[PDB]
């Protein structure tokens, strides 16, 4: 007694509606495929379009082939009120159920219907006529969700986050689960970091000091201050991600791979409806040492306003960046982070 997901039910609903508009006797796999290439109600990217476009195929050609093959189906003269499923479609629904149990999922989703679709010879010649490798789209569907199982009725989102999951860590959700420890003696420097983020000019703080001094403790303090809603109006409901440069580097063995991954992370941020503050440790390994390509990706994104960045570097390394990039100095506010022994002495003097 398995149940469908909300998006899977929408596909079967659109397929039932498309067969009714074309007045076709029975529901066929071509209808479900036509429901996949259908533009969603909210203008979001369809699930199948993302797989095909990221596979670097011509999606417009694919739509044109599916439509001309569906119009090729003759229209019955008197439209009945009973659109039964065909024998070919019955196997698809039965095949999607075993695909769900094969992957140990709790619900039948778009993926399972799409996988069971790939087995029908009707849609197999559709992909061949559209010159789209059907086995490459299958690989795209496998890599998409990763290894996260489908537990809820709405776990099969069309375009899940691919770059923010591989090369970033959500510090906010990690703070909700009590995986962080509040370090003492740094609330004054946390207050300054949040004050800069609420600003509209130079809204990107940059922590200055030697690594391992408590910089990571300040970021974890800002995250837990966003969770309990102790932040100004602008930061209410904002997620705090941490860019993993080691993950960006591992596997990038081709020229431009690092920039492509970094551009993909920023793209998922700028399209997010909620404001996202990205923390970049050792930011000099991005904006300095003659790395102009990475700088030309972050600087325009900061101007659009959707992204706020918390940088972290040493004093001499920050001065090295500013000495050859005035535009960087006008977007980042300097915040000095000293060792507790030095922080206590300065306050006494």
Numbering used by the authors: 4 to 352
Could you pull the original sentences from the published paper?
Hsp100 protein disaggregases are powerful molecular machines that harness the energy derived from ATP binding and hydrolysis to disaggregate a wide variety of aggregated proteins.
To solve the phase problem, we crystallized an engineered Hsp104ND1 construct featuring three methionine substitutions at Leu36, Phe118, and Leu248 (Hsp104MMM), and determined the crystal structure of this variant by seleno-methionine (SeMet) MAD phasing. The unbiased experimental map enables tracing of residues 4 to 352. N domain segments involved in peptide binding include helix A1 (Leu12, Leu15, and Gln19), helix A5 (Gly93, Leu96, Gln97, and Ala100), and additional hydrophobic residues (Phe7 and Pro88).
